[PDB]
Design an enzyme around this catalytic site. Structure first.
Site, mmCIF file in Angstrom:
data_model
loop_
_atom_site.group_PDB
_atom_site.id
_atom_site.type_symbol
_atom_site.label_atom_id
_atom_site.label_comp_id
_atom_site.label_asym_id
_atom_site.label_seq_id
_atom_site.Cartn_x
_atom_site.Cartn_y
_atom_site.Cartn_z
ATOM 1 C CB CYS A 37 -0.981 -0.057 1.280
ATOM 2 S SG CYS A 37 -1.956 1.236 1.269
ATOM 3 C CB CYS A 40 1.064 1.369 4.109
ATOM 4 S SG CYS A 40 -0.727 0.825 4.617
#
Length: 116
Positions: A37, A40
């Site tokens: 991600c 992230c």
């Protein structure tokens, strides 16, 4: 390049979450994340600084939702990246999506009144 002292974070799993996060009598911050991600990957270096700087006030931890989706749905935090702050092994605050150092240290200056 990397080094064993480049971070002060801990890593937790569905088999160890109770022994580290729920075990802590001090404030502990869990970032529910995955390496796949973008947001992230963007909040990870800001949390790494927050782990290295705020160790005296709080502990900083990671739960990898790619290998522990059990723990991701347990708190309904699957909408990653998702930050939970616990105190004395009980949840106290929730945050979602990436932060920069200024936004992350405002939300953690809420427990570190020294800065920012």
């Amino acid at each position: 390049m990397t080094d064993s002292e480049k971070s002060a974070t801990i890593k937790v799993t569905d088999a160890s979450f109770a022994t580290d996060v729920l075990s802590s009598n001090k404030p502990v911050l869990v970032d529910f994340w995955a390496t796949w991600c973008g947001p992230c990957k963007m909040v990870a270096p800001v949390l790494e600084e927050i782990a290295t700087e705020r160790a005296t006030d709080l502990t900083v931890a990671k739960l990898d939702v790619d290998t522990n989706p059990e723990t991701a749905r347990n708190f309904q935090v699957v909408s990653i990246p998702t930050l939970i702050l616990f105190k004395d092994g009980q949840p106290v605050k929730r945050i979602v999506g990436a932060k920069g150092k200024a936004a992350l240290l405002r939300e953690l200056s809420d427990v570190v009144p020294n800065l920012n």
